[PDB]
Every structure is written in C-alpha cells, then in structure tokens.
A paper describes a structure:
CDV is an enveloped virus with a non-segmented, negative-strand RNA genome that is classified in the genus Morbillivirus of the family Paramyxoviridae, to which the measles virus (MeV) also belongs. CDV has the attachment glycoprotein hemagglutinin (CDV-H) at the virus surface, which utilizes signaling lymphocyte activation molecule (SLAM) and nectin cell adhesion molecule 4 (Nectin-4) as specific entry receptors. CDV-H consists of an N-terminal cytoplasmic tail, transmembrane region, stalk region, and C-terminal head domain. With regard to viral entry events, there exist proposed models in which a conformational change of the H protein induced by SLAM or Nectin-4 binding causes a structural change in the fusion (F) protein at the virus surface, leading to fusion of the virus envelope and the plasma membrane.
Residue numbers in the entry:
A (entry chain A): 161 to 174, 183 to 241, 246 to 305, 311 to 497, 502 to 602
B (entry chain B): 158 to 178, 184 to 238, 243 to 306, 311 to 485, 490 to 495, 503 to 529, 531 to 602
Write the structure that this text describes.
Amino acid sequence: KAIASAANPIRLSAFPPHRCSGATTSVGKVFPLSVSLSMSLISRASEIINMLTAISDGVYGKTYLLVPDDIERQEIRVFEIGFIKRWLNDMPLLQTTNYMVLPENSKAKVCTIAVGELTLASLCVEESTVLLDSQDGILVVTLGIFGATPMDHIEKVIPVAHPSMEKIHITNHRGFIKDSIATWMVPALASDKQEEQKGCLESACQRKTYPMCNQTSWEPFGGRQLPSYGRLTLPLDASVDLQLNISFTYGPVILNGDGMDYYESPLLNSGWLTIPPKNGTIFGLINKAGRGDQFTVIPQVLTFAPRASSGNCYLPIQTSRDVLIESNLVVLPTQSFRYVIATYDISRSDHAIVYYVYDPIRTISYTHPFRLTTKGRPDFLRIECFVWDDNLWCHQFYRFEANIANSTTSVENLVRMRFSC
Amino acid sequence: GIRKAIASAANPIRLSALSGGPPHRCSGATTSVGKVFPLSVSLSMSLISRASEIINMLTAISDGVYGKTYLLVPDDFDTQEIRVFEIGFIKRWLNDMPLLQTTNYMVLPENSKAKVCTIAVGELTLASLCVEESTVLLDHSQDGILVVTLGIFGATPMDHIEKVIPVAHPSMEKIHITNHRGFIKDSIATWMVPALASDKQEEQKGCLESACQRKTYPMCNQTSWEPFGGRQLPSYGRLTLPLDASVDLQLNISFTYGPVILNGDGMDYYESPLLNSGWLTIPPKNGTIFGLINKAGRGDQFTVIPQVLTFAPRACYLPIQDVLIESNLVVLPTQSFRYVIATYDISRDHAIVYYVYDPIRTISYTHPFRLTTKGRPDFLRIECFVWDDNLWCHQFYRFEANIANSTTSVENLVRMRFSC
Ligand SMILES: *[C@@H]1O[C@H](CO)[C@@H](O)[C@H](O)[C@H]1NC(C)=O
Ligand SMILES: *[C@@H]1O[C@H](CO)[C@@H](O)[C@H](O)[C@H]1NC(C)=O
C-alpha cells in the first residue's frame, strides 16, 4: 500500500534574486485561496496556537494547537498533511489530504514537525525539557499522505541517548525526512567537554567582552550550563519498532534555545541547522550540520559565529528597534546559498511583515514589507519558504493580540516576492 | 498492495465506515431544532469564502464519500466558466460533526465542452457525464458525451476523461441532460434523464387524453411538451456506465414509459432497499405542479413505476397540480421510505424550510432555517444523509441581493432534530 499510495501522487509532485546590483525593486503578493483545515478553522474565528509548518517535495505538513469552542470533550493537538497543487494562474494551492487529532492523555503540548516521502513526522512532549535521565519518553507521531495506513504511528518511545547527555529542550523545531529517516535538531546538555568549553569561552572573554560572560543563567537550561547541539534521529523502517537515537556535539555558542530548525542541503548527508534571532540582540545562525554517522556542527556564515583564536570554541557574538517579534531562519532550497527572516515591523504608518532575504556570500540583502490592514502586537511569527516557478514563496503564520480587542487573532497565508531592477 | 485500486481502498474504507448507526408519534405539537455547521475543508467552500461565484453546484453523498461538480467564474471566446469536480470524505470532527474534507479535485479545460454535467459518487469514485447542449441526439458534431471519472486520491487508473458515443436502444432520438444526481453501485454508475423515443407512444396519448376527459388540466391543451418541444411525450431514460477497467467505457442508454413527465428540467436517482432498483425523483415546478417519486429498475429490466405523488384518473399516472424557487426531491438513505424537499419561503426573515415526508405513518415534519441575508433566489439544491441517527442536508443556493449587482452563492450543512 505504501508504494501504491506513492505511485498516485507523483503527478502532484510536478533564480529568485537579481544577478547584479543597482536599484532593487521588490513586488509582493498574497494568495488567500487554500483548502487547508487550519485556514478553514481560522475563517470560523477559531484560535490556532503555535503552528509549525514544514514544506519539502511538493507535500506540506502542519502541526498546531486548537482552542475549542465551549468543548473540552484544554487545547487540542492537530496534525495536517497535503499537497501543493497548481491552481489557476499557476498559484500554489495547499490542499489537505489527511489530518489527525490527539486526545488529551497523549499530552502533546509541544510537538516538532517534519515532512518528506509522503509522510509527516513529529516528536511530542508535555514538558519542553526532557531528561535523559521513572524514564522520560517522547511521543512519536507519524501520519501518511492519505487515509489509514501502516504509515500512521502514535507511540511513546524511550530515547536512546549517548552517555552521558542529561537534557534536551524541545520547543519549535522543523526537521525533515530523507532516505526514510526523520531528523531534528534541538538544544542539548551533556557532561562531556562541558568544563573545557566554558573554560575556552572564559578564555575568550579575557580579550573581548560579550553579554554572556557575566550571565548567571544561560539560555535553554538555567544556571551556567553551556548548551550543545542535539541531533534527533528517527528511522521510519518497518523492520523493527521505532527508536529515537540522540547524538550531541558542540559548535557555535547557542544563545537562543527557543527554536532550532533543520533544512535539507544540496550536500548529501548534510543539512542546515538554523537558530532564529531573539530580542533584537541574538543574531540568527546558520550551521552545516551532519546527519550521518558523525555529528558535526560548523558555522556556514562566519561573521555571526567566528571561531576563537585560542582553543576549540567559538565566539558568542551578540549585541549590547521597531521589530516586536522576528523568526525564523529558513534556508532556501536553491543551489545558491540564501536564507530568509521575517519581522513584525511597526516603524511605518501601518504594521508590516517584512521579509529579509540574505545572500551572504556577495554580502547583499533584499527586503520587502507586507503591509497589514490590522494592527496589534504579536506573540508568535513563523515562516516556511519554498521556490515555485522561479519565485520565492513563503507560508507565514503569525498570532497577535489587537490593541482594541480582547482576544488573540491568528493569521495564515501564502506570500510571494519577486526582485528586479 | 499490488494494485492501487485495492490499496487506495484498504486505506479509506476504514474511514468511510466511520459513519455508523424520527420518533413514534407525539402528543401535541412536535418540536424541530435545527443547526448550521459552517466548518468545511472543501474546495467549493474555500472558493465561496473568497467571494468567488459558484454556479450550479450538484452534490452527491453516499457511503461517507461526497462528490461535487460546479462552475467556477474566475477573475482572469465566450464566457469563461470553469468546470470543477471535487471528491472527499465526511470525517467525524469534534462534537461528532460531519466535516467534508476534499481529498481530490480536478479542473477541466475549455476544449472539453462541459457546460452541463451530471454527478454520482460511490465505491470511492466520482462519475460524471458532461455535454454542452442539454439535448443529446442519438440519430443520424455527432453527439457524444464526455465521461469523467475521478478517483478518491491522486492520479489513478480510476481517473478517466473520455468522450464516448452512447449505445442506445433502437430507436431513441433524444435525451435531455440538465441537473441529475445518480449513484454508483456494483461498479456501475446510473443516471435517469428525460428521453424521447418513437416506440409505443399511442398507449400514453390514450391515457393522457382519458385523464382530462372528466376534468380540465393545463396539460390537455398542450400541443408541445416541455423537454423536446415536440408533440410526443417524454419517456424515462436510464444512463448506465460501467466503471470496470475490464472493458473500455461504453454508455448504455435504455428507455421506458411511466407516469407522465411534465418537468424535463431535472431527474435525480437515489439508491433503494429493493434489489437492482432505486428511487427516480422529478423536481416540482412553479405554482403547484409538484414533483413525483417513482421506483426505477437498475438491472437488466428497466421499469419506472410510480411510488408517491401521482394520481390515477381512469381505473398511466399523472402528477398533482410565498415560495419563490424550489427544486430537488431527495429520498433519504434509510430502510423506511422518507423524502425531503426544502423551499425558499418569504412568509416571515427569509427562510429555507425543509419538509420531510414519512408517508407510511402519514406524517410530515417541517423546519425553517431563517436567513441573516435577504434577496431573491436563482438556484436551490439539497443533498441529505443520516449522521448519528440525525437528519443532515448539504444545501447550496444562489440568490441575487437587493443591494448588489451580481449573484451571491451560499453553501453549508444543516441538521434537523425532531422531538416532543
Ligand atoms: C542510534 O543508535 C541505534 C542503536 O545503536 C542504532 O540503531 C542507530 O543506527 C544509531 N544511529 C546512528 C546515526 O548511529
Ligand atoms: C452495455 O452494452 C453492451 C452492448 O450493448 C452490453 O454487452 C452490456 O451488457 C450492457 N450493459 C448494461 C449494464 O447495459
């Protein structure tokens, strides 16, 4: 049934910037049409919380929390998967083909998201901090592209971690599925090389002050415990039951533990481990992350995480605006290296969702704002971008509370950006 | 999983079986409580949400699978209007509400002249017959019909877009395809349409003339009957389409005379508890020229025999002669024979009031749905089903507002409960 439900949608499985400088003109468009469960719920004024979306090979997959309408049988975990079909005017139309709801006893307050090979993968936990280490387990959730299939799984798995990791911090994490293997990246904590790396970092703050070497509480885990990079591997082989291998490695200093996405890379058995910016002081990060046997995290852009002149550590480059929320880091599925970040900007007469597309090799950055008829200030912003007909498309979902209203509004739509002279 | 048909059948027949499951009189007044369920993951509902106009949406519901066909007017030679097909499930949402989720859809280009298309669903498949002109000739552009088949998911051998020349009985002359719901059973899609034939005409001219020989009806001065305008009465035509891939597609057309047909603008066909049979219903017409329900054979024998809503003058049958529009007589998918019809009533707010007739107990329930909007209607279409032993109806209507210039389309699910 797997290969039959795979032969059916291959029919449905069918450069952005300017090559030179000068004046840059950016034209944007919002495409509102969508056959998605999430957008239908948003139209009926239902409240969607923390929608994480992953797009890969023409298949899309969302996970989010639904706030019900006087119903408790207090939030509901929902998974959604479908296609990106070509609508009239060659517009990308997201059509849901399968979805699934969890009851509250599977406790899925925090869930990851990944799509690929007509499958949706998600790791769910009630508390964000998982101990490694009464054994703390993770809820593995897999959903097929269509109907009820052996592809579907709802199991509680005990992770197989390296000795010795202590914790991981699961918040908002996009992974991806390739070679029938789902991979995520999360902030981790381990005993190995902990004092050595704080020692190398402290020997780095003897030559240059950073807003971290006096910090008594580092980001993901309270106290002065340095976070590492954790790699969550989940095979989708049916030969044996599901097991979650967790690896760890030190890389650039992690200053944001509230998000760590992972995008596929043109290099085989490698990927882009990205960390979003926060508070206006923590820069975003892009790292080369290995997904094979050896797990190595090495920076791609060398100016937001340069290596220290002495030792095996990196420099925690930080900063001592009218952007309220900003997230996340999306590496575009292009052969040329480009990444995107969207901000909720209030510097103009109207509020705007302003996209920044960085080409860091040539040190150029394009920008385009999407002006909002509504006004208010957001608590969440999430982008997932893809290329469609030589154009940059982004699925954006943001959640904001209005200045004049009492309730919190959720917004979700597709946007396109073109860049010319 | 060697064949996609049975693999794409093992996955959703578990989900089409999710739908599993009218009191005994009442002392005094009988209370009916209604509800509108607006949530839907349907392409048609999404298009309506962006104020795009959907025209002539025919919907068929069967075994937990739904299927729509309609015309979409976009905003980008003749018109242009776009034929759209849609098929999906009725999944159980929170609070056990019926949620229509599209699982596959398809759009036709304009070299397929598909202005008029029938609709039928069953066995995880959507079947449709398409023509530009409603009148198809079967005589001597040699009239073919566009067979359109759509699978439950993705691109499958179930999908077909072929233009077939119908194989009719000798000799039928015409059929009139407008708004016709059929259904798919035993890998056969069946529709019923008004037909025209040479044979055995004298029997019904004699019964027809003998009906007004005691009482005048606005029918015995008629020198021209409706669908084909000629001086010969239309008959009942049965369009049979096998969906087996064992043989290439062939459109079998049979015909039989039954109760006198006075309305050629619609003829729907619902499944019946009787083996190899179904319920052929004909919609009402303005005034009180009402619709009729007949038992129609679906096997080797094609017989159309009146069930309700036709009287007998001499000892054939004839139909009975503030509601602005009304079409579509729907037989409920129950073991007991019950049928539904909803009207656009303006006697009150405006309302869509459903009438559910249970003739065995000689009882009829009614319920109005008051409209927040006001205006005058151009189209009304209902398709009803049972969900948790409750009466649900998918309704789509098209009306022109007092305040606008263009016509607005509305589509939603309604439920009706009856209590004491
Ligand atoms: C993770 O550990 C398990 C158990 O040894 C193994 O099956 C799996 O291959 C490991 N993953 C990697 C990437 O080494
Ligand atoms: C359809 O027509 C062909 C030839 O007239 C015949 O072999 C077949 O039995 C017919 N089937 C039905 C259901 O009418």
